């Protein structure tokens, strides 16, 4: 039910959120 | 910021980068402002990190005209589960641009304009309140540019 691509994009998104704050 | 211009710049930049488009139009040459330049640069870094961690993004997109909007919305809704942040917004732009690239690759160029509209719609209806509450795109440019 969870979208695998959405989770992958989210993972990298959260990596970037940390790095730049 | 004009949301429509931001989407057009980033997608156009990506389509040129991947060799699908050349010449006049949004995305051609340098970005018109620091916001566009910042989004281009972090988007490039994002797509590189994504490919290294998983695999190439535009090649897990399986695109048809009848399913594209549904799939765009499903992926985006999962991406933003728990709330937006700036990194997830970059993810969203990269995904939308990759959907456009894959549409051109699969000889469905008319989807490019549709996907851009869907991006603008999603930004203005799902993400606009968070963006404004968080200092707007000016804040993004300061953090990421």
mmCIF file of C-alpha atoms in Angstrom:
data_model
loop_
_atom_site.group_PDB
_atom_site.id
_atom_site.type_symbol
_atom_site.label_atom_id
_atom_site.label_comp_id
_atom_site.label_asym_id
_atom_site.label_seq_id
_atom_site.Cartn_x
_atom_site.Cartn_y
_atom_site.Cartn_z
ATOM 1 C CA UNK A 1 0.000 0.000 0.000
ATOM 2 C CA UNK A 2 2.946 2.297 0.704
ATOM 3 C CA UNK A 3 4.510 3.628 -2.496
ATOM 4 C CA UNK A 4 8.145 2.401 -2.797
ATOM 5 C CA UNK A 5 9.235 5.288 -5.046
ATOM 6 C CA UNK A 6 7.682 7.827 -2.690
ATOM 7 C CA UNK A 7 9.594 6.291 0.230
ATOM 8 C CA UNK A 8 12.871 6.372 -1.693
ATOM 9 C CA UNK A 9 12.392 10.010 -2.688
ATOM 10 C CA UNK A 10 11.456 10.812 0.917
ATOM 11 C CA UNK A 11 14.633 9.117 2.210
ATOM 12 C CA UNK A 12 16.881 11.236 0.033
ATOM 13 C CA UNK A 13 14.746 14.290 0.822
ATOM 14 C CA UNK A 14 15.266 13.800 4.538
ATOM 15 C CA UNK A 15 18.998 13.292 3.999
ATOM 16 C CA UNK A 16 19.076 16.694 2.304
ATOM 17 C CA UNK A 17 16.952 18.289 5.025
ATOM 18 C CA UNK A 18 19.563 17.274 7.629
ATOM 19 C CA UNK A 19 22.598 18.344 5.640
ATOM 20 C CA UNK A 20 21.313 21.863 5.018
ATOM 21 C CA UNK A 21 19.930 22.358 8.554
ATOM 22 C CA UNK B 1 7.977 33.744 -6.590
ATOM 23 C CA UNK B 2 5.925 32.627 -9.588
ATOM 24 C CA UNK B 3 5.350 28.924 -9.009
ATOM 25 C CA UNK B 4 4.626 28.325 -12.707
ATOM 26 C CA UNK B 5 7.951 29.933 -13.696
ATOM 27 C CA UNK B 6 9.873 27.927 -11.071
ATOM 28 C CA UNK B 7 8.426 24.640 -12.319
ATOM 29 C CA UNK B 8 9.036 25.587 -15.960
ATOM 30 C CA UNK B 9 12.638 26.624 -15.264
ATOM 31 C CA UNK B 10 13.566 23.491 -13.388
ATOM 32 C CA UNK B 11 11.855 21.049 -15.766
ATOM 33 C CA UNK B 12 13.246 22.888 -18.794
ATOM 34 C CA UNK B 13 16.719 22.833 -17.281
ATOM 35 C CA UNK B 14 16.439 19.098 -16.681
ATOM 36 C CA UNK B 15 15.110 18.373 -20.193
ATOM 37 C CA UNK B 16 18.045 20.290 -21.681
ATOM 38 C CA UNK B 17 20.502 18.576 -19.378
ATOM 39 C CA UNK B 18 19.285 15.162 -20.557
ATOM 40 C CA UNK B 19 19.477 16.179 -24.231
ATOM 41 C CA UNK B 20 15.766 16.255 -25.054
ATOM 42 C CA UNK B 21 15.437 20.008 -25.641
ATOM 43 C CA UNK B 22 17.763 22.731 -26.865
ATOM 44 C CA UNK B 23 17.356 26.420 -27.670
ATOM 45 C CA UNK B 24 14.844 29.022 -26.533
ATOM 46 C CA UNK B 25 12.400 28.635 -23.654
ATOM 47 C CA UNK B 26 12.334 28.197 -19.872
ATOM 48 C CA UNK B 27 15.445 26.452 -18.608
ATOM 49 C CA UNK B 28 17.695 27.894 -21.328
ATOM 50 C CA UNK B 29 20.946 29.379 -20.084
ATOM 51 C CA UNK B 30 21.463 30.580 -16.498
ATOM 52 C CA UNK B 31 18.508 30.794 -14.118
ATOM 53 C CA UNK B 32 16.870 34.221 -13.973
ATOM 54 C CA UNK B 33 17.319 34.508 -10.201
ATOM 55 C CA UNK B 34 19.125 32.988 -7.182
ATOM 56 C CA UNK B 35 16.058 30.836 -6.406
ATOM 57 C CA UNK B 36 16.171 29.127 -9.783
ATOM 58 C CA UNK B 37 19.923 28.683 -9.544
ATOM 59 C CA UNK B 38 19.659 27.178 -6.054
ATOM 60 C CA UNK B 39 16.897 24.747 -7.104
ATOM 61 C CA UNK B 40 18.890 23.649 -10.165
ATOM 62 C CA UNK B 41 22.031 23.017 -8.142
ATOM 63 C CA UNK B 42 20.473 21.108 -5.249
ATOM 64 C CA UNK B 43 18.217 19.240 -7.656
ATOM 65 C CA UNK B 44 21.322 18.067 -9.499
ATOM 66 C CA UNK B 45 22.899 16.955 -6.233
ATOM 67 C CA UNK B 46 19.665 15.219 -5.238
ATOM 68 C CA UNK B 47 19.326 13.256 -8.465
ATOM 69 C CA UNK B 48 22.965 12.134 -8.208
ATOM 70 C CA UNK B 49 22.478 10.978 -4.594
ATOM 71 C CA UNK B 50 19.244 9.210 -5.517
ATOM 72 C CA UNK B 51 20.876 7.260 -8.338
ATOM 73 C CA UNK B 52 23.803 6.185 -6.167
ATOM 74 C CA UNK B 53 21.577 5.034 -3.322
ATOM 75 C CA UNK B 54 18.845 3.349 -5.324
ATOM 76 C CA UNK B 55 19.043 3.451 -9.103
ATOM 77 C CA UNK B 56 18.287 5.904 -11.890
ATOM 78 C CA UNK B 57 14.987 7.621 -11.120
ATOM 79 C CA UNK B 58 13.562 8.222 -14.615
ATOM 80 C CA UNK B 59 13.863 4.470 -15.213
ATOM 81 C CA UNK B 60 11.419 3.319 -12.535
ATOM 82 C CA UNK B 61 8.787 5.607 -13.938
ATOM 83 C CA UNK B 62 6.400 3.635 -16.083
ATOM 84 C CA UNK B 63 4.332 6.265 -17.793
ATOM 85 C CA UNK B 64 0.969 6.151 -19.583
ATOM 86 C CA UNK B 65 -1.355 9.106 -20.291
ATOM 87 C CA UNK B 66 -4.260 7.476 -18.439
ATOM 88 C CA UNK B 67 -2.282 6.605 -15.313
ATOM 89 C CA UNK B 68 0.211 9.482 -15.093
ATOM 90 C CA UNK B 69 -1.798 11.861 -12.903
ATOM 91 C CA UNK B 70 -2.781 9.105 -10.462
ATOM 92 C CA UNK B 71 0.795 7.889 -10.189
ATOM 93 C CA UNK B 72 2.168 11.425 -9.813
ATOM 94 C CA UNK B 73 -0.265 12.055 -6.940
ATOM 95 C CA UNK B 74 0.365 8.693 -5.239
ATOM 96 C CA UNK B 75 4.148 9.126 -5.244
ATOM 97 C CA UNK B 76 3.869 12.747 -4.086
ATOM 98 C CA UNK B 77 1.439 11.894 -1.291
ATOM 99 C CA UNK B 78 3.818 9.230 0.034
ATOM 100 C CA UNK B 79 6.783 11.612 -0.283
ATOM 101 C CA UNK B 80 5.005 14.160 1.908
ATOM 102 C CA UNK B 81 3.553 11.821 4.506
ATOM 103 C CA UNK B 82 4.512 13.346 7.863
ATOM 104 C CA UNK B 83 4.724 16.852 6.409
ATOM 105 C CA UNK B 84 6.787 18.839 3.931
ATOM 106 C CA UNK B 85 10.338 20.007 4.383
ATOM 107 C CA UNK B 86 12.794 21.673 1.998
ATOM 108 C CA UNK B 87 14.555 18.400 1.124
ATOM 109 C CA UNK B 88 11.256 16.739 0.266
ATOM 110 C CA UNK B 89 10.367 19.748 -1.894
ATOM 111 C CA UNK B 90 13.592 19.191 -3.845
ATOM 112 C CA UNK B 91 12.617 15.515 -4.185
ATOM 113 C CA UNK B 92 9.251 16.608 -5.582
ATOM 114 C CA UNK B 93 10.819 18.817 -8.270
ATOM 115 C CA UNK B 94 13.289 16.079 -9.240
ATOM 116 C CA UNK B 95 10.469 13.523 -9.494
ATOM 117 C CA UNK B 96 8.259 15.816 -11.597
ATOM 118 C CA UNK B 97 11.145 16.603 -13.921
ATOM 119 C CA UNK B 98 12.002 12.907 -14.209
ATOM 120 C CA UNK B 99 8.389 12.129 -15.128
ATOM 121 C CA UNK B 100 8.636 14.757 -17.870
ATOM 122 C CA UNK B 101 11.927 13.347 -19.140
ATOM 123 C CA UNK B 102 10.538 9.812 -19.238
ATOM 124 C CA UNK B 103 7.438 11.090 -21.076
ATOM 125 C CA UNK B 104 9.603 12.587 -23.833
ATOM 126 C CA UNK B 105 11.723 9.402 -23.961
ATOM 127 C CA UNK B 106 8.555 7.362 -24.472
ATOM 128 C CA UNK B 107 7.257 9.717 -27.211
ATOM 129 C CA UNK B 108 4.549 11.287 -25.094
ATOM 130 C CA UNK B 109 5.786 14.864 -25.154
ATOM 131 C CA UNK B 110 2.303 16.299 -24.534
ATOM 132 C CA UNK B 111 2.480 14.899 -20.991
ATOM 133 C CA UNK B 112 5.270 17.367 -20.182
ATOM 134 C CA UNK B 113 2.837 20.280 -20.085
ATOM 135 C CA UNK B 114 0.315 18.242 -18.123
ATOM 136 C CA UNK B 115 2.872 17.149 -15.531
ATOM 137 C CA UNK B 116 4.037 20.762 -15.074
ATOM 138 C CA UNK B 117 0.419 21.813 -14.471
ATOM 139 C CA UNK B 118 -0.016 18.999 -11.941
ATOM 140 C CA UNK B 119 3.143 20.156 -10.198
ATOM 141 C CA UNK B 120 1.875 23.732 -9.976
ATOM 142 C CA UNK B 121 -1.504 22.467 -8.775
ATOM 143 C CA UNK B 122 0.057 20.270 -6.106
ATOM 144 C CA UNK B 123 2.391 23.053 -4.970
ATOM 145 C CA UNK B 124 -0.409 25.623 -4.702
ATOM 146 C CA UNK B 125 -2.911 23.304 -2.968
ATOM 147 C CA UNK B 126 -0.852 20.974 -0.768
ATOM 148 C CA UNK B 127 2.418 22.745 -0.166
ATOM 149 C CA UNK B 128 1.716 26.499 -0.326
ATOM 150 C CA UNK B 129 0.713 26.933 3.302
ATOM 151 C CA UNK B 130 3.860 25.148 4.553
ATOM 152 C CA UNK B 131 6.121 27.103 2.205
ATOM 153 C CA UNK B 132 4.667 30.433 3.343
ATOM 154 C CA UNK B 133 4.751 29.406 7.019
ATOM 155 C CA UNK B 134 8.427 28.471 6.670
ATOM 156 C CA UNK B 135 9.627 31.842 5.358
ATOM 157 C CA UNK B 136 8.853 31.224 1.692
ATOM 158 C CA UNK B 137 11.215 30.320 -1.139
ATOM 159 C CA UNK B 138 13.586 33.089 0.049
ATOM 160 C CA UNK B 139 14.341 30.857 3.028
ATOM 161 C CA UNK B 140 15.117 27.919 0.752
ATOM 162 C CA UNK B 141 17.523 30.060 -1.292
ATOM 163 C CA UNK B 142 19.337 31.123 1.893
ATOM 164 C CA UNK B 143 19.622 27.569 3.217
ATOM 165 C CA UNK B 144 20.496 25.832 -0.056
ATOM 166 C CA UNK B 145 22.026 28.390 -2.421
#
